[PDB]
Amino acid sequence: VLYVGSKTKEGVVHGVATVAEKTKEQVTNVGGAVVTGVTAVAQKTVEGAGSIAAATGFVK
Amino acid sequence: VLYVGSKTKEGVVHGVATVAEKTKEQVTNVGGAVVTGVTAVAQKTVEGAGSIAAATGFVK
Amino acid sequence: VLYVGSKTKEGVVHGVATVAEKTKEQVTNVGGAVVTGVTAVAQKTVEGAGSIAAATGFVK
Amino acid sequence: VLYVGSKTKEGVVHGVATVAEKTKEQVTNVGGAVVTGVTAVAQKTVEGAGSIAAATGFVK
Amino acid sequence: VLYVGSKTKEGVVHGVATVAEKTKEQVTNVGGAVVTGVTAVAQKTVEGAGSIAAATGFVK
Amino acid sequence: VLYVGSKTKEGVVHGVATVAEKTKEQVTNVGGAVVTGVTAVAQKTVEGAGSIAAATGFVK
Ligand SMILES: O=C(O[C@@H]1Cc2c(O)cc(O)cc2O[C@@H]1c1cc(O)c(O)c(O)c1)c1cc(O)c(O)c(O)c1
Ligand SMILES: O=C(O[C@@H]1Cc2c(O)cc(O)cc2O[C@@H]1c1cc(O)c(O)c(O)c1)c1cc(O)c(O)c(O)c1
Ligand SMILES: O=C(O[C@@H]1Cc2c(O)cc(O)cc2O[C@@H]1c1cc(O)c(O)c(O)c1)c1cc(O)c(O)c(O)c1
Ligand SMILES: O=C(O[C@@H]1Cc2c(O)cc(O)cc2O[C@@H]1c1cc(O)c(O)c(O)c1)c1cc(O)c(O)c(O)c1
Ligand SMILES: O=C(O[C@@H]1Cc2c(O)cc(O)cc2O[C@@H]1c1cc(O)c(O)c(O)c1)c1cc(O)c(O)c(O)c1
Ligand SMILES: O=C(O[C@@H]1Cc2c(O)cc(O)cc2O[C@@H]1c1cc(O)c(O)c(O)c1)c1cc(O)c(O)c(O)c1
C-alpha cells in the first residue's frame, strides 16, 4: 500500500488573531525595497525556490 | 505498507495571538532593503531554497 | 511496514501570545538591510538552504 | 463653562479579534440557567442595575 | 470652568486578541447556573449595581 | 477651574493577548454556580456594588 499516507499537513497556518493599532504609520523609501505587514501566509513548493517576505535593493 | 505515515505536520503554525500598539511607527530607507512586521508564516519546500524574511542590500 | 511513522512534527510553532507596545518606533537605513518584528514563523526544507530572518549588506 | 467636557468615553469596547475553534461543543441544562460565548459587549446605565452576563437558577 | 474635564476613559476595553481552540468542550448543569466564555466586556453604571459575570444558584 | 482634570483612566483594560488550547474541557454542576473563562473585563460603578466574576450557591 505504497504511500497510504493519511491526513498530513504541510505549509499550514490556522487560528491566528491579530490587532494592530497605530496612530501614524509611515513608510518612505527612495530607490530600495520595503516589505511590511505580512501576516498569516502559508506556502508549499516542489522543485523551486520558496521565498515569502523577500526584499532586495538592486541586482546587476 | 511502505510509508503508511499517518498525520504528520511539517511547516505548521497554529494558535497565535498578537497585539501591536504603537503611536508613531516610521520606516525610511534609501537604497537598501527593509522587512518588518512578519507574523504567523509557514512554509515547506522540496529541492529548493527556503528563505522567509530575507533582506539584501545590493547584488553585483 | 517500512516507515509506519505516526504523527510526527517538524518545523512547527503553536501557542504563541505577544503584546508589543511602543510609543515611537523608528527605522532608518541607508544602503543596507534591516529585518525586524519577525514572529511565529515555521519552515521545513529538503535539499536546500533554509534561512529565515537573514539580512545581508552587499554582495560582489 | 459648566461641563465643557470634551471627548469622553464610557462603556466602550473597540479593537477586538477572536478565533474560536472547537470540534464538538455541547451544552445541556435541566431546569437551570446557562450563559456562554459573550464577547465584545459594552453598556452604560444611569439610575438602574447593570448586569451583563447574569445567570440565575430559581427565584422564589 | 467647572468640570472642563477633557478626554477621560471609564469602563473601556480595547486591543484584545484571543484564540480558543478546544476539541470537545462540554457543559451540563442540573438546576444551577453556569457562566462561561465571557470576553472583552465593558460597562459603566451610575447609582445602581454593576455585576458582569454573575451566577447564582437559588433565591428564596 | 474646578476639576480641569485631563485625560484620566478608570476601569480600563487594553493590550491583552490570550491563547487557550485544551483538548477536553468539561463542566458539570448540580444545584450550584460556576463561572469560568472570564477575560478582559472592565467596569466603573458609582454608588453601587461592583462584583464582576461572582458565584453564589444558595440564598435564603
Ligand atoms: O508521489 C509523489 O512523487 C514523489 C515525489 C517526486 C517528485 O517530486 C519528482 C519526481 O520526478 C518523482 C517523484 O516521485 C516521488 C515518489 C514517491 C513515492 O512514494 C514513490 O513510491 C515513488 O515511486 C516516487 C509525490 C506526491 C506528492 O503529492 C508530493 O508532494 C511529492 O513531493 C511527491
Ligand atoms: O514519496 C515521496 O518520495 C520521496 C522523496 C523523493 C524526492 O523528493 C525526489 C525524488 O526524485 C524521489 C523521491 O522519492 C522518495 C521516496 C520515498 C519513499 O518512502 C520511497 O519508498 C521511495 O521509493 C522514494 C515523497 C512524498 C512526499 O510527500 C514528500 O514530501 C517527499 O519529500 C517525498
Ligand atoms: O520517503 C522519503 O524518502 C526519503 C528521503 C529521500 C530524499 O530526501 C531524497 C531522495 O532522493 C530519496 C529519499 O528517499 C528516502 C527514503 C526513506 C525511506 O524510509 C526508505 O525506505 C527509502 O527507500 C528511501 C521521504 C519522505 C518525506 O516526507 C520526507 O520528508 C523525506 O525527507 C523523505
Ligand atoms: O447633565 C447631566 O446631569 C447630571 C446627572 C444628573 C442625573 O443623573 C439625575 C438628575 O436628576 C440630575 C442630574 O444632574 C447632574 C448635573 C450635572 C452638572 O454638571 C450640573 O451642573 C448640574 O446642575 C447637574 C448629565 C448628563 C449626562 O450625559 C450624564 O450621563 C449624566 O450622568 C448627567
Ligand atoms: O455633572 C454631573 O453630575 C455630578 C454627578 C451627579 C449625580 O450622579 C447625581 C446627582 O443627583 C447629581 C450629580 O451632580 C454631580 C455634580 C458634578 C459637578 O462637577 C458639579 O459642579 C455639580 O454641581 C454636580 C455628572 C456628569 C456625568 O457625566 C457623570 O458621569 C456623573 O457621574 C456626574
Ligand atoms: O462632578 C462630579 O460630581 C462629584 C461626585 C458626586 C457624586 O458622585 C454624587 C453627588 O451627589 C455629588 C457629587 O458631586 C461631586 C463633586 C465634585 C466636584 O469636583 C465638585 O466641585 C463638586 O461640587 C461636587 C462627578 C463627575 C464624575 O464624572 C464622576 O465620575 C464623579 O464620581 C463625580
Numbering used by the authors:
A (entry chain A), B (entry chain D), C (entry chain B), D (entry chain E), E (entry chain C), F (entry chain F): 37 to 96
Please, what does the article write about this entry?
α‐Syn fibril is also recognized as the key pathological hallmark of these diseases. Hence, targeting α‐syn fibrils is crucial for therapeutic interventions and early disease diagnosis. These fibrils are involved in a wide range of pathological processes, including cell‐to‐cell transmission, cellular membrane disruption through mechanical forces, and the triggering of neuroinflammation. Given the significant role of α‐syn fibrils in various NDs, extensive research has been conducted to develop chemicals for either binding to the fibrils for diagnosis or disrupting them for potential treatment. Moreover, we used cryo‐EM to explore structural alternations in α‐syn fibrils induced by two chemical compounds, EGCG and CCA, and correlated them to the potential mechanical changes.
We first selected EGCG, which was previously reported to bind and destabilize α‐syn fibril. After helical reconstruction of datasets using RELION, we obtained a 3D density map of the α‐synEGCG fibril at resolutions of 3.1 Å. Compared to the apo fibril, two extra densities alongside the fibril core were revealed. Therefore, EGCG may interrupt the salt bridge between Glu46 and Lys80, which is pivotal for the stabilization of the Greek‐key‐like conformation in the apo α‐syn fibril. Furthermore, EGCG forms a hydrogen bond with the backbone amide of Tyr39, subsequently perturbing the interlayer hydrogen‐bond network within the fibril structure. Thus, insertion of EGCG into the polar groove may prise off the protofilament and destabilize the entire fibril structure.
